[PDB]
Amino acid sequence: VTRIERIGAHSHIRGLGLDDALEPRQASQGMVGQLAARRAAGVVLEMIREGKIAGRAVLIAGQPGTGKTAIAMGMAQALGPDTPFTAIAGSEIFSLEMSKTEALTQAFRRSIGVRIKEETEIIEGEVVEIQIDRPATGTGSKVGKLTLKTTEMETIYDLGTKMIESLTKDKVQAGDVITIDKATGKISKLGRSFTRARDYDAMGSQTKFVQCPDGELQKRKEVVHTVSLHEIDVINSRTQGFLALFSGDTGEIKSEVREQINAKVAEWREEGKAEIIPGVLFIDEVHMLDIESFSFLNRALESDMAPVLIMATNRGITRIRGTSYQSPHGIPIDLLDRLLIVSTTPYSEKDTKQILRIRCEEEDVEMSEDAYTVLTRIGLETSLRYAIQLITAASLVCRKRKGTEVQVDDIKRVYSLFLDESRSTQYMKEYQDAFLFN
Amino acid sequence: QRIASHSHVKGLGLDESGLAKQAASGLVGQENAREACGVIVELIKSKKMAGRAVLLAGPPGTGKTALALAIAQELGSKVPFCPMVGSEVYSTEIKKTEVLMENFRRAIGLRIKETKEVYEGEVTELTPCEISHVIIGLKTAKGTKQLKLDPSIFESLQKERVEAGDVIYIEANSGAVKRQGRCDTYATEFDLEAEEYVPLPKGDVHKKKEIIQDVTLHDLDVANARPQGGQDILSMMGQLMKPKKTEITDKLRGEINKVVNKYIDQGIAELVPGVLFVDEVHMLDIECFTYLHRALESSIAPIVIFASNRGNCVIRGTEDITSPHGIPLDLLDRVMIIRTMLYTPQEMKQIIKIRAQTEGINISEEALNHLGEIGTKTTLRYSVQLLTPANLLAKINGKDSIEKEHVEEISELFYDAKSSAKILADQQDKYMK
Amino acid sequence: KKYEHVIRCRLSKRQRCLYDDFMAQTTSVINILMQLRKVCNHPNLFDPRPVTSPF
Amino acid sequence: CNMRTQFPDLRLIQYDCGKLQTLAVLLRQLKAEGHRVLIFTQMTRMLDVLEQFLTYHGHLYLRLDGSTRVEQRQALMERFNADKRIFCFILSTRSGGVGVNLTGADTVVFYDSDWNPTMDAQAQDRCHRIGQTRDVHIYRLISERTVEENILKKA
Ligand SMILES: Nc1ncnc2c1ncn2[C@@H]1O[C@H](COP(=O)(O)OP(=O)(O)O)[C@@H](O)[C@H]1O
Ligand SMILES: Nc1ncnc2c1ncn2[C@@H]1O[C@H](COP(=O)(O)OP(=O)(O)O)[C@@H](O)[C@H]1O
Ligand SMILES: [Mg+2]
């Protein structure tokens, strides 16, 4: 069965593939080559993990198809789910609901996580017998008694009215393994230790059982709650903020709310209530930001709640959007002075062949050596992405003719069927008048 | 605490005569600029002039924002300091002039004395009195008192599910009823009650506490423009149906001004004029500058500090009108210009050393000299930003201090703007656009 | 049988600040002594953390 | 409600006093090992703060603060000696007289030390007296580099 996540462009990248000294291996964790850029990415990753310096900016710049987004995905996979990683495109900040500065602020504050750790008393056991006595008619005080069992304990609890109501709402029966939090009174059923009586009808197919919990009844467990700054801002902006967390529609959050939240989070950090988990914001194709967005970035990186900012761009000296000024990478020099630039070099023949081999391994495609040579030649002549696509195309063509290994004939067939940019442009020049404009 | 870009700036480093010490309070040069900023700080502390504008002008990396934050630190946390970027006036909800006015009112603070009336105790009687009022009996460790409360308070008590035996907190000013828990004396009756218990209050049933509240004029304007203090259905409806910002009228601001003047006359309020800081002023358009003319001419406005690194540049919103700082000459006539200069290599070394000490990094003299040389070319910002990666490299190699080899390795790994520009120029045909 | 244990405890930041303020106010000794004992007991004996509400 | 009024966190009561943290650790250990604790303090406001802390942590307690009526004192003694749920019994050293028979507990914690060791001895003997069938442990809490070291030295 196929999960919602399938083989994508960067599905083979499991990390930067570095050793302890941040020295890049030639081929490890999907990454091949780009040794200097991977070493720089590892240094940046260590800086992120340390989480002590706020508002650091790194720019991964290089020619198209050199692995900028691959390096970003490797950094994201090496960080792990514990550290926030907000990946957005540059075009996403242009929104009809909010200003560009508001979108950038929300992107920054989605990359900082606030973690609250507290210890609570927890009762987890198998329900042996539950008895609830209620008045037949009219308002009255329900009286009840509950018996819970573990492998080494069994205690009979006298129940109050609100716990009676909670148990009634949850429909707790005998044999249900339930968890009760003493403070909030929340009850969560986590399984049935055995089946219900067979003589009952309209009950459905009984599922699998759950082994009874061991140890003491009333334990003490550590509960961890982690939210981002953006979630706090949204739920504090208005009453319907919890719904705005999912529908968007947050509008523009007042600066007063954000200042208060920053102060409160600082107070929690000083008092040891909460820990701040700085993350990364990755803006792919940062050249689509305009001058106002860059100017906002300039001073927004100077806050102590700012995350590490990583940008990727493949532009040379290009006009800055919203202006008539040519600048390196499409970025104003004032922002370029605030950031370290990581250059990506073009790939050689052996690096291209190794990338093709890793892609074929990821896609479960078996290819011959001659086919690998031809595909590497095509990738060097045309582009890496075209060869990557021809991998799957030739796999399908080979499977159509009831084969098992992708041969040179299949690669030639898919090369004939599907065109790259260069051959398409040539054929369009051959029939220039037929196409509509220019 | 995380270390930010200006975490070492603690003050202006001025002596008693107003002259600028060379290296003090995390500042290394800009003695003339620091003396001017000290004069501006004294002006803000005088609380006499209104709408006096100052422009910090100079190339990037010359510590204009550092000087603004140093002014903020010199003033103290009591004096409001609102930092805003020029790009923030372009909201999709309200007009740009409204944003400017809101930040102007945000810069003016008000310290007002308030008395809180508190009913705190364990509920012993909750008897409705037919719209139905409530008669409530509260007991503490010091006594018992019976109170008659409004039907809104009764509705709040019902919403809090307050029953006989619960410890409650009532604020008489806002009518805010909070149920804290079932009294501790009943914590033994059951074994599983699904309740949070709270001890009996040990003071009196009725308490009056006087506190000092720190508010701004903008807060009063917002409270009076999108009211939520009535606790009626209409307030909730207005909050839910109209959540966006609105263009507050001059009439509301005049009424709020009258209210604040009345409070000050009564002796229960103190005014703190405060400061507004606009960092990227060149990002404003001609309409914003034209509005700022009248806004600065106002007798209510705060002291505004502007910053700009632009040269002879076209003003935004105009076709081809070019002005010395991106600021039209009319507004430049209304500002006092503080000029910041580029730093000498000695000052660059001093700033690098201060930043290294701030980030908890030990750097050798040879490494410090090499990094200052790297900063002589490229920029000071680039040289400063190599400190943490070099520390990480030294830690990886087992060294507790940065040597010259680590700085060289980091500089090889990470390019600066000029080196990347050279690479782009050499390979213009390979990059897009 | 009976046993006696003595456990040493450290002061919080608020307790340390109050203790230093009182020791500075020293320069009668009985009143200072009582205030220091109260500080060592709990700083909430002087003023609880405020319940903050809108104006 | 959360947007309308904010109350100080009950956790900050323990965070502002090292004695409260150490006493929380000690009381958790004592409840784990299955003992009953007597807490003696010289001040009734300290009794109130201890009530807040114990109720926050979930320790059931009874209180005799020296202002309780005499007829209630015997009832409280009988309830504490009869009820096994009541973990702690906060008391004032200067009160209670000599007629109180608290043999139900087996641990005494002195939150603060009295200038007169006789009062602490009486507080101990309230639980160490004849007819008590368990080992008695006495815990004294002293703040480092404070007046309490002088108080302990004098005692
Ligand atoms: N060094 C590398 N190692 C492994 N795969 C790579 C490498 N560089 C690029 N790729 C793969 O090539 C494809 C295109 O590279 P990509 O990162 O999209 O280029 P760009 O930097 O132009 O975005 C991606 O699917 C990526 O996984
Ligand atoms: N006089 C100074 N002393 C110490 N550090 C400085 C000084 N001037 C600038 N810096 C540092 O150099 C960096 C650039 O300052 P910034 O105010 O951002 O420049 P500008 O505002 O002119 O663009 C900041 O991180 C600041 O901490
Ligand atoms: Mg990409």
Q: What's the domain range around A103? A: 8-112+228-347
Of A347, A381, A412, which marks where a domain is finished?
A347
Q: Using a CB-CB distance cutoff of 8 angstroms, which residues of chain D are in contact with residue A185?
A: none
Report the alpha-carbon distance of residue A47 to residue A53 in Å, rounded: 8
Residue D72 amino acid letter = Q
Q: Classify residue A380 by burial, with Cβ atoms within 10 Å: 0-12, 13-18, 19+.
A: middle
Do residue A283 and residue A319 come from a single domain? yes
On whether residue B362 sits in a domain, the answer given is: yes
* CA-nearest residue, atom 16 of ligand 1: A67
On chain C, the residues whose CB falls within 8 A of the CB of D43 are 38, 41, 45
Q: Is B331 helix (H, G, I), strand (E, B) or coil?
A: helix
Retrieve residue D36's tokens.
């009953």
Residue A223 and residue D9: Cα distance in Å, rounded?
17
The contacts of residue B101 (CB under 8 Å, 6+ apart) are B248, B253, B295
Closest C-alpha to ligand 1, atom 1: A32
CA dist B305 and A413 (Å) reads 68
In the three-class reduction of DSSP (H, G, I as helix; E, B as strand; rest coil), residue B236 is classed as helix
Torsion sign, CA atoms B284, B285, B286, B292: negative
Looking at B165, B196, B223, which one is the last position of a domain? Answer: B223
Tokens of B75: 């003033």
Instruction: Tell me if B178 and D85 make a contact (CB, 8 A cut-off).
Output: no
Ligand 2 pocket test, candidate residues B30, B65, B69, B85, most atoms within 8 A of CB? B65
CB A342 within 8 Å of CB A312: no
B398 is in an annotated binding site: no
| Alpha carbon B123 to chain centroid, angstroms | 42
A67 marked among binding-site residues = yes
Q: Give the whole-angstrom CA distance, residue A197 versus residue A347.
A: 68
Q: How far apart are CA A67 and CA A45, in angstroms?
A: 17
- Residue A104 and residue A232 in one domain: yes
Of D3, D15, D58, the CB nearest to A271: D15
Q: C-alpha distances in angstroms, B354 versus A416, B340, B345?
A: 64, 20, 14
Distance CA A102, CA A253 (A): 8
Residue C48 CB contacts under 8 Å (≥ 6 apart), including other chains: D8
Does B72 lie in the same domain as B38? yes
Contacts by residues A93-98 (CB-CB < 8 Å, ≥ 24 positions apart):
A93/A289, A93/A293, A95/B92, A96/B92, A97/A248, A97/A249, A97/A250, A97/A251, A97/B92, A98/A250, A98/A251, A98/A252, A98/B92
Domain end among B327, B342, B357: B342
> Does the annotation flag A254 for ligand binding?
no
Domain co-membership, B98 together with B8: yes
CA A69 to CA A41: how far, in whole Å? Answer: 12
Asked whether residue B161 falls in the same domain as residue B203, the answer is yes
Task: Supply the DSSP symbol for A151.
Answer: S
Cβ(A22)–Cβ(A42) under 8 Å? yes
CA angle D89, D95, D98 (to 5 degrees): 90
| B91 and B232 part of one domain | yes
Atom of ligand 2 nearest to the CA of B67: 17
DSSP code string of B300-324:
S--EEEEEE---SEEPTTSSS-EET
- The residues lining ligand 1, judged by C-beta closer than 6 Å to any ligand atom, are A 9-10, 13, 30-34, 64-70, 314, 355, 384-385
Tokens describing residue A56: 């650091």
Ligand 1 atom with least separation from CA of A68:
21
Handedness of CA B20, B22, B23, B28 (dihedral sign): positive
CATH of the domain at B139: 2.40.50.360
Asked whether residue B233 falls in the same domain as residue B338, the answer is: yes
Strands (DSSP E) along B130-192, which ranges? 133-139, 144-149, 166-171, 176-183
Q: Chain B partners of C54 at a C-beta cutoff of 8 Å? A: 174, 223, 229
Domain with B44 in it: what CATH number? Answer: 3.40.50.300
Comparing C-alpha atoms, which of B87, B181, D2, B399 is closest to residue A332? Answer: B87
Separation between Cα atoms, residue A20 and residue A37, nearest integer Å: 16
- Secondary-structure breakdown of chain B: helix, strand, coil percentages, each rounded to the nearest 5: 40, 25, 35
Report the alpha-carbon distance of residue D92 to residue D51 in Å, rounded.
13
The answer to whether the CB of A288 falls within 8 A of the CB of A312 is no
- Which residues have a Cβ under 8 Å from the Cβ of A102 and sit 6 or more positions away? A252, A253, B91
Cα–Cα distances (Å) from B375 to A176, A343, B58, B401, in that order, read: 69, 20, 18, 20
Q: Are residues B235 and B97 in the same domain?
A: yes
Q: Which residues contact D24 (CB under 8 A, 6 or more apart)?
A: D14, D53, D57
Q: Which domain holds residue B12?
A: 1-106+224-342
Q: Is residue A431 located within the same domain as residue A326?
A: no
Q: Which residues of B are less than 8 Å from D55 in CB distance?
A: 184, 187, 197-199
Give the strand pairing for D136-143 and C2-9. parallel
Q: CB–CB of A282/A58 below 8 Å?
A: no
Query: Is A64 marked as binding a ligand?
Result: yes
**CA–CA separation, D72 vs D61, rounded Å?**
15
Are the C-beta atoms of residues A91 and A340 closer than 8 Å to each other?
no
Residue D40, φ and ψ in degrees, nearest 5? -110, 125
Distance of alpha carbon A316 from alpha carbon B29, whole angstroms: 36
The sign of the CA dihedral B27, B31, B37, B38 is positive
Please name the residues in contact with A425: beta carbons below 8 A apart, sequence gap of 6 or more: none
Q: Which of A7, A10, A343 for mutating ligand 1's site (highest number of atoms within 8 Å of CB)? A: A10
CA of A313 to the centre of ligand 3 (A): 8
The resolution, in angstroms to one decimal, equals: 3.6
The answer to whether residues B91 and B229 belong to one domain is: yes
* Paired tokens of B264: 């000050």
Rounded CA gap, A26 and A21, in Å?
Answer: 14
Give the total number of structural domains in chain B. Answer: 3
* In a domain? residue B432: no
Chain breaks in chain B (C to N over 2.5 A) after: 130
Residue B260, classed as helix, strand or coil, is helix
- Given B316, B342, B368, the domain boundary residue is B342
Closest alpha carbon to A53 in B432, B392, C18: B392
Q: How many CB pairs under 8 A join A and B?
A: 217
DSSP-assigned letters across all residues of D75-86: HHHHHHHH-SS-
CB contact under 8 A, D146 and C19: yes
**Any B CB within 8 A of D1 CB:** yes
User: In this complex, do D7 and B202 lie within 8 Å of one another by their Cβ atoms?
Assistant: no
- How distant, in Å, are the alpha carbons of A299, B88, C46 from that of B292? 22, 15, 49
| Residue C28 distance to chain D (closest CA, Å) | 15
Rounded to the nearest angstrom, the distance between the alpha carbon of A68 and the centre of ligand 3 is: 6
Gyration radius of chain D over CA positions: 16
Q: Does residue B69 sit within a domain? A: yes
Question: Is there a domain that residue A194 lies in?
Answer: no
- Which among A316, A347, A378 is the end of a domain? A347
A98 in the same domain as A39: yes
Strands D61-64 and D88-92: parallel
Number of domains composing chain A? 2
- Return phi, psi of residue A342, to 5°: -115, 115
Claim to verify: residue A107 and residue A232 sit in the same structural domain: yes
CB A218 within 8 A of CB A121: yes
Phi, psi dihedrals of residue A245, rounded to the nearest 5° = -65, -25
Task: Report if residue A157 sits inside a domain.
Answer: no
Cα–Cα distances (Å) from C24 to C21, C27, C47, in that order, read 5, 6, 19
DSSP class of residue A186 equals -
Breaks, C-N > 2.5 A, in chain A lie after none
Q: Is B322 labelled as part of a ligand binding site? A: no
Cα D11 from Cα A428, distance rounded (Å)? 73
